[PDB]
Every structure is written in structure tokens, then in C-alpha cells.
Amino acid sequence: MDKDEAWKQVEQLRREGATRIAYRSDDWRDLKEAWKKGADILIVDATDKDEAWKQVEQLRREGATEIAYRSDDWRDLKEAWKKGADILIVDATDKEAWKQVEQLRREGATRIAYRSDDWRDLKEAWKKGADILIVDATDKDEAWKQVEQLRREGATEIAYRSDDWRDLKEAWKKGADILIVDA
Ligand SMILES: [Cl-]
């Protein structure tokens, strides 16, 4: 439900090469339209696995990249990966989540992401195999401080979710390279 202001801010930074835009939507056609407008990561999160995997398959047919899929269950992520998803988002917002990362690593996945509101959780996931660390802490004030800590720890691919362009901009300044906006 993001306003156009959120996309507007990430678009300006994306054009300057200062960020990648990740876009989440429940409709693959909306994801395709976003890809054509310059979105770099398309997040499928349909809870129905049949629909979600169908959305991954259709985005692959369209040539869209990079396709992401989000789940709390490594098995769903592994199926999405087989069907065309490149970025596998372990959702730790309701936790164990670290074990999902470990199993995906055992399966051979090398573009694992992890979504959490706590930098210490994200740091552990990073050590265990997650390469994209998603700070999603809209219920926590100044969550870009979590970005700052992960940046000092040496993580190279930090993403940040907010519906407010001001928060997105500050997270970029603190070291986020992927900004997540929503339909
Ligand atoms: Cl600053």
C-alpha cells in the first residue's frame, strides 16, 4: 500500500546507481510492470504455493530478473528456486529461522536472504549462509541503526523496508544497497 512517493525516492537513487529497488506485490502482472519500470528485484510472496510458484514460473517466462520468493519454510523456497526464483528470502519475522538458512545452504543455494527486525539475528543468519540481510523493522524507531551496525560488521548486501521515503533515504545513507517498496 505504499504511496507513489516511496517509489519516486528509490527511483532517483536507482537511476544514479545508488540503490537497487526491490518491489513486493501479490500480482505477478504488477511485478512485471515494476520490472519494466526499473525494479531490480521482484518479490513473490503469495501464501498459496500453487499461485506463488505459478507467478515465479510466469516471471521467468517473461525474462524478469531477479525473481525473489519469501517463505518461512525452506522447502517452499527450494521449490521456488527450482521454478525460477534466484533470491530465496527466509522470513524470520515469526520464528528456527537460522535452520532454514542452513538447510538451503546444504541444498546448494547461494543467494539466500533473511528478513528480520534484529541486527543480531541478521548477523547470525549471515554467518550461516544468508548473503542478503533484510532489515524490516517498521515497528522499531530508527531501524536504520540496524543497517549501521550490520554495515560495521562487514555485511555487503543490506536491504531495508519502509513505506516512508524519508526512512528509505536514511537507510541508504547508513549503508543499505537495496530498498524495498510495496504495491
Ligand atoms: Cl548520515
Residue numbers in the entry: 1 to 95, 97 to 184
Question: What does the literature reporting this entry say, word for word?
Answer:
Protein stability can be fine‐tuned by modifying different structural features such as hydrogen‐bond networks, salt bridges, hydrophobic cores, or disulfide bridges. Among these, stabilization by salt bridges is a major challenge in protein design and engineering since their stabilizing effects show a high dependence on the structural environment in the protein, and therefore are difficult to predict and model. In this work, we explore the effects on structure and stability of an introduced salt bridge cluster in the context of three different de novo TIM barrels. The results show that despite the similarities in protein fold, the salt bridge clusters differently influence the structural and stability properties of the de novo TIM barrel variants depending on the structural background where they are introduced.
Rosetta modeling of the salt bridge clusters results in a good prediction of the tendency on stability changes but not the geometries observed in the three‐dimensional structures.
